[PDB]
């Protein structure tokens, strides 16, 4: 999965850099929220295609709902990585 | 396609207007990056909520009493990343005002 | 009109809080771990930053159990006989929770050390 490979090449980073333990706590989380929501949001998925194949009004409603939660905290996690590295090297 | 209904454009504005107050306010980096996440997490939980309710009813109209469950246990959840943002919104400006 | 929803909403979240308190030692447990550590962090000589950090990543867990529980209710609903999809959907739930929790222990051993160490 290439979603690990972006969560472990973020830790190493936030380790490689040199901040304080806080920073680290937020630079970390916050990529461990996108995988959070990636996984709940695929479980979601799952439970719509265990019901049928077949499209329906509110299956596309479940999924669309469940990417934007993807993309909230995916840009949640931009965010904090701008603002924290913005401060780290101001 | 969800974007056009009053209760999301209810939570979705006040969202919004919290990023945007949270990225004008003279605070340090650590305290604007946790005024901001913790709204956007009031977001991210409402919308993995409606989209279990979405799956319920796709299911059906019958009632059904896990049919019900599901949907209060989201709303538990919105209900705890609601108060999780108050509690941090008030923690770090009691402290900075 | 945006009061009612607040009254209604508010509602539905207490039967869920007492319907998984009701139904599970483990999750009464959980709470009771949530619950103790919010107080501690509470009472802690730091930093405001770090209280919150404290605070939210045990909320988080919160929070990830509690909508995990919305999707095994679902998948329970649509019924008991085993299918892919379902045991797919609940390990799929099931790691977003131990990821919360894994994150929580770690930001309070990460955080507590480095204010006693
Ligand atoms: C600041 C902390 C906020 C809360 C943090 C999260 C805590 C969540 C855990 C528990 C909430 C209470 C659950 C209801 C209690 C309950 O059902 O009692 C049994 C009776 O119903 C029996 O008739
Ligand atoms: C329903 C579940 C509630 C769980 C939480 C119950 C509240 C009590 C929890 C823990 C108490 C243990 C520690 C007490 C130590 C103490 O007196 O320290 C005071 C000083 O540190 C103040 O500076
Ligand atoms: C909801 C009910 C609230 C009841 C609250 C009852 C009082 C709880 C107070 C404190 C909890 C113990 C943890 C903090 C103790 C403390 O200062 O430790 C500083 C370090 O030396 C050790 O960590
Ligand atoms: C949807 C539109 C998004 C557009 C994004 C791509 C374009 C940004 C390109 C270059 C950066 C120019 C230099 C700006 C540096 C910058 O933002 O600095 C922060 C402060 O310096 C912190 O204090
Ligand atoms: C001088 C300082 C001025 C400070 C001004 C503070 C204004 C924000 C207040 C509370 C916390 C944010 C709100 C948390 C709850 C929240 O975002 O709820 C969304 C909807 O109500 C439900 O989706
Ligand atoms: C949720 C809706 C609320 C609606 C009412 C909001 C009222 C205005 C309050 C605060 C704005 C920020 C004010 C402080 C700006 C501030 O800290 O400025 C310092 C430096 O000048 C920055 O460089
Ligand atoms: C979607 C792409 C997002 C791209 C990034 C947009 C972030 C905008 C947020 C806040 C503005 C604050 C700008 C300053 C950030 C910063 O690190 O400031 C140092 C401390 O905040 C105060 O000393
Ligand atoms: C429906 C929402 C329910 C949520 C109810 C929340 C009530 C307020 C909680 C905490 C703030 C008290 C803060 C006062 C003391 C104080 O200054 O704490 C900050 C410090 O800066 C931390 O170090
Ligand atoms: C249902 C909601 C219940 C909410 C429960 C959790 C509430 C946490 C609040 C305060 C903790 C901090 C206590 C005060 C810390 C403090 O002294 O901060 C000022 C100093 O003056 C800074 O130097």
Redesign the interface.
């Known amino acids: 999965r290439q979603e690990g490979v972006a969560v472990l090449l973020c830790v190493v980073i936030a380790a490689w850099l040199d901040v ?7 630079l ?3 990529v ?2 996108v ?3 990636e ?6 998925e ?6 049928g194949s077949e499209y ?1 009004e ?9 990417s ?2 993807v993309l ?2 995916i ?2 996690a931009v ?2 990585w701008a ?2 590295l ?2 780290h090297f101001g």
């Open positions: 304080d333990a806080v920073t680290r706590v937020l970390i989380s916050s461990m929220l995988m959070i929501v996984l709940l949001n695929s479980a979601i799952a439970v719509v295609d265990r019901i329906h509110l299956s596309g409603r479940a999924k669309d709902l469940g934007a939660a909230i905290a840009i949640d965010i904090t603002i924290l913005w401060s």
